[PDB]
Each structure stands twice: as C-alpha cells, then as structure tokens.
Design a protein around this ligand. Structure first.
Ligand SMILES: */C=C/C(=O)N1CCC2(CC1)CNC(=O)c1cc(-c3ccnc(-c4cccc(OC)c4)n3)[nH]c12
Ligand SMILES: */C=C/C(=O)N1CCC2(CC1)CNC(=O)c1cc(-c3ccnc(-c4cccc(OC)c4)n3)[nH]c12
Lengths: 305, 305
C-alpha cells in the first residue's frame, strides 16, 4: 500500500442526451465544441464543452486526461461531467462562456482593473494549491489554460500533461513556461508549477503579452542560466514583481509555495491600488483596528495541509 | 470495515497565539468571543471566533463538536481552525463578522432583495448537500445557525447535535424546526434536515419571524398531525411556497433532496423577481437561446453523488 485507492466515479454519458452542438475552435489541442447536455428523466439543461483530441493513440491520452479530471473536485479547477464513447472518445466539461483568460485580458484590457487582476492570481493559486494536496503536478500552467466562467470566477484547465506524485520522457513542450530544471534535466515538481505560475501572473499583468517575444525556444535555457528574466510590467509595483522574481529562483526550495502565494495576493487584493498602478482604475466595469489591517488574512485564505 | 478511516487533523493551538479577545455574547449555547489568532513565525493575523460551552461533561460534548468540525471542509460549512486546551476546552473558528442570518434579516429587512434571499437558499442547500455526502445529519438547521461571512457568503454552523450515518435519546430539542417523525419517534435522517431547511427558508422569507409564534412546543406535534403548516409569506410566490410545503410532507421520501433544492433555487436565482415580490426590490443595496433559459442549470449547481 503505497497510495490510497481512487474511488472517483467515471460517468458514461449517452450521445442522445446532447443537443445544439456547435464548434468553438480547433488546433494542436484538438477540437472543442459547445453544446447542451439534457439528462434523461430530469428537467435540466446543462451548458457543456465537448473536447476531442486530434485513434488508438488519441483514445489512450484523452482517457488519461479523463482520469485526472474525474479525480479532482475544487471550485478553481475544471469539472469533468463525464465521457461519451463515440468512435473517438469525447470529454464532457462545464462550459466557460468567456473563454480562456489570455484572450480575455487582451480583448478587455481597457476595462480590467487591479481588483480583478489580483483576485485572479488568488483563485489560480487556490486551484494549484488544491492540485498539490492531491499530489498532481500540472506541467502546463499558463494564461491560455485558465478558463473564465465569469469575470469574477476562473478555473484551471487542460490536464493532458498532468502527472501524479511530484522524470519525464522526451516530447513537444511549453519551454517558455517551464522551470530551468525542467528544461535541462526534465525534473518536474510542485515548485516547477510555481515558476509557471509566475509566468502566468506576468502574462496577466502585461495584458496578454507573449513571454520572450521574438526569442526561439532553444535559446531560452541559456538565457535563464545567464540570470535574465521576464521584465517588470508597467502597472506592477516592486512588491508584485518581487513575487514573480521569487517564483523564478534557480533553487526550487527558495521559491514560494502556493499556500504562501494565496496569502500574499489576498493581502494585496484588500488594497489593490497600492500594488497595481493602472490608468483609469476607478471606473473599470466588467459584467477592525488600523494597525492590524496590513497583515490580516481571512481563514479561507489561510490554508492548512 | 464498516466505515472508512477519518484522517482529519486536529490542530492544538497555543493560548499565547491569541490577542485582542472580546466577548460577543452568551446564553444556553455557551459563550462566544471574538479575537485575533497570530501563528508563531508567520506574518499573518487571522480573525477568529472562540466558543466555550457552559467541566468533564462540558469538555466531552465540545470535543464531540470539534470532531465533526475538524472532519468537514466546504465553502458553505463553518471551518474549525483548531482547539485550545485551557481548563475548559475552546473551539477556534473563522470569524463571521455580520453574525447569524436570523439577526441579519431582522436588522436589514428594508435593504434585503430577492437576489440575496434566493442566493442564501442555494448556499444553505449546498452546505447541507455536502453534509449528506459526508453522512452527517445536522439535527439543528435554523436561521440562527447560518452565519454571515459577508452578505454574499453564508455558512452553516453549530454541530452540537450532529450525528453520523443518517434513533436519538431524550433531551432538550428545537421542536419547531423538527420533522413530525423526529418529534413523535425520535427518528432523524437527511430528510428530517430537509424539513428544517423548509422552516429555515420560511424564516428568511418572513424576515426573521418566529415560527408558530405564541404556540407552545408541546402542542406542535398535534398541530402538524392535523395537517396545519406554516403560512405563506407575503413576498412568496406560489412557486417558492410549494417548495416549502414539499419539505413538510409527512412521508420523508416524498420530500425533495438537497441536490434538487440547489437546482430549483438556482433556476429561481436567475430571475428572482418572478419568484419573490418585494416592495422596492430594484434599489436594494448591501455591503444563449430564449427557449432554453427556463430549465438551464450551471454544472456547479448540478451535483452528482
Ligand atoms: C485561449 C486559449 C485557447 O484557445 N486554447 C487553450 C485551451 C483549450 C482551447 C485552446 C485547449 N485545452 C483545454 O483543455 C481547453 C478547454 C477549453 C474550454 C472548455 C470549456 N469551454 C471553453 C470555451 C471557450 C470559448 C468560448 C466558450 O463559450 C462559447 C467556451 N473552452 N478550451 C481549451
Ligand atoms: C443569531 C443567533 C445566535 O445568537 N446564536 C446561535 C449561534 C451561536 C451564538 C448564539 C451559537 N452556536 C454556534 O455554533 C455559534 C457560532 C457563532 C459565531 C461564530 C463565529 N463568529 C460569530 C460572530 C457573531 C456575531 C458577531 C461577530 O463578529 C463581531 C462574530 N459567531 N455563533 C454561534
């Protein structure tokens, strides 16, 4: 008995229960449709996303992704409703109508204030801390893989590279989000996800800029070994940028834990304009003792293992 | 092996880590203080409530309550941070600054709109559905035992009468919230908590009225056997009152499950003024295809066992 038994339920959903299916997009990730799941004998209509990878090799890797998603349950992690057994296997997930966070921050950069930016950092850190408690290394954390249910509520998605108990084989990888030890030695831990979280925060604070724009992926390892890092965003205070820099330390144990990031960003979220300087932050719209106030943290943001 | 092992952690917290302790109130429940928990070697201050029952018999029943609270983890259920081993044992919980929901609805009745009322019904149902998955019967669900973290966020509290695997002994009980089978035969199930949920919803919709006001507790059993129930609140539509009436059925299996109540109230929460008629509902302030819209439910409100 090395590990406890996984008693998660894999729901097999009938093809006849799905209606109004339309394509949202496609690429290397595969194909994602939007649809309407109507369970039989229940007056309920559930907006769902339906994912197909781009047959034996496709079904193996997609069912590995279904295994991980069926095993997780957290408000800031994406929910698998079930799978549909067609010729190629389909993952049925909750619909996140506003899309990925990277596209959201690019499209609404003029209406995104410091409160929303800092709240997203807290929610992403809460999702990743949950994944650490479940002993999962995500290995693909980026702004593209954070989905927006509403502007106030984001969730982590895409568990295609996810692995239990945080050495990987060779393949096609997101070099620009990876820790230096992951690029050189193929070592992946929870602390390598913290590096990726730092890069994800930098994406949001720059309003969806590409990290190391122009630089090819092969040159990134040598750039990071020389001590170069992503530059300070215009809106970021030294306080916020110091947290990103701490995520990009060479020593993995020197980096902050996700529980510490939850605490630190939630303090900043109580006084957002002290930590992010955004032009026109007041009119942004999207659809106790004084001495104590600085170091105050709510119990819901102070997470015990 | 009848039941799985409970691997929950009981944190023992030092008396020297608590500061600024002030009394909030006292009664039959015991005494509740507000305070500030400062963990040693961490720059963090956590607002906490500290509960003491009103010594061997007091320590036994309070540690039974600590056992249940240490075992639960849900956003709509109250969080135990730990216990403090003084002469009489103290439960350390998260602070809920706005107090209990019963007192909140009485104090702010002029500023409470249909959106908040229906959202509270959903959140309470989510907390109770979680407790059903954990095989806990609360046995004391009422507006007094729902605490307000913020006006947008409520949690269930007080597990002094909580019991595992849903026959009780004789004692002092909340007769006016109990199911008829619990009053007559001392039978307690998850379906007896649904009756109490119905009475809790009636408390909110009447803005904190006392149920069966004037009637003594001994006469309640005979009143319910005759078919009498709590009357329809002025603000309630027939739709909302039908859900309360369904909670008060004689047959426990005919009552709705908590997962069904989550679904039904969340549909109503999308169009609140169709289901609750409140004078001046528009200016209340507290600190897709058209054919589908009626039966639409988000995946987060469609809870699978
Ligand atoms: C913006 C990044 C992007 O385009 N990606 C990365 C995520 C992507 C799709 C390509 C690939 N991998 C996933 O795991 C995944 C899941 C989803 C997804 C799930 C649910 N809902 C949506 C969605 C997107 C846009 C609009 C709507 O509503 C109409 C819904 N997407 N996407 C991905
Ligand atoms: C309004 C009902 C009431 O007064 N009660 C019932 C709940 C009560 C106190 C008496 C007894 N049992 C409990 O389990 C419990 C827990 C709390 C509680 C926990 C955390 N914070 C508070 C609180 C109340 C009022 C104001 C503040 O902030 C200053 C905090 N209460 N209360 C109870």
């Amino acid at each position: 008995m090395g590990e406890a038994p996984n008693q998660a339920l894999l729901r097999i959903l009938k093809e006849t229960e799905f209606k109004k299916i339309k394509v949202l997009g496609s690429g290397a990730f595969g194909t994602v449709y939007k649809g309407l799941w109507i369970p039989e004998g229940e007056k309920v209509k559930i907006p769902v996303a339906i994912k197909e990878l781009r047959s034996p090799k496709a079904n193996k890797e997609i069912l590995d992704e279904a295994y991980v998603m069926a095993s997780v349950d957290n408000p800031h992690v994406c929910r698998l409703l079930g799978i549909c057994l067609t010729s190629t296997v389909q993952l049925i997930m909750q619909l996140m109508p506003f899309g990925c966070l990277l596209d959201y921050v690019r499209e609404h950069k003029d209406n995104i204030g410091s409160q929303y930016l800092l709240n997203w950092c807290v929610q992403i850190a809460k999702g990743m801390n949950y994944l650490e408690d479940r002993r999962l290394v995500h290995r693909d954390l980026a702004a593209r893989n954070v989905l927006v249910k509403t502007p106030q509520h984001v969730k982590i998605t895409d568990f295609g590279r996810a692995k239990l108990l945080g050495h990987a084989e060779g393949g096609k990888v997101p070099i620009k989000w990876m820790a230096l030890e992951s690029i050189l030695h193929r070592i992946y831990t929870h602390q390598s996800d913290v590096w990726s979280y730092g890069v994800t925060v930098w994406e949001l604070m720059t309003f969806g800029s590409k990290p190391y724009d122009g630089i090819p992926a092969s040159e990134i390892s040598s750039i990071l070994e020389k001590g170069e890092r992503l530059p300070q965003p215009p809106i970021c205070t030294i306080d916020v940028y110091m947290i990103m820099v701490k995520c990009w330390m060479i020593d993995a144990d020197s980096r902050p834990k996700f529980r510490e990031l939850i605490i630190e960003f939630s303090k900043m979220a109580r006084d957002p304009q002290r930590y992010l300087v955004i032009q026109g932050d007041e009119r942004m719209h999207l659809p106790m003792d004084e001495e104590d106030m600085d170091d105050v943290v709510d119990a819901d943001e102070y997470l015990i293992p």
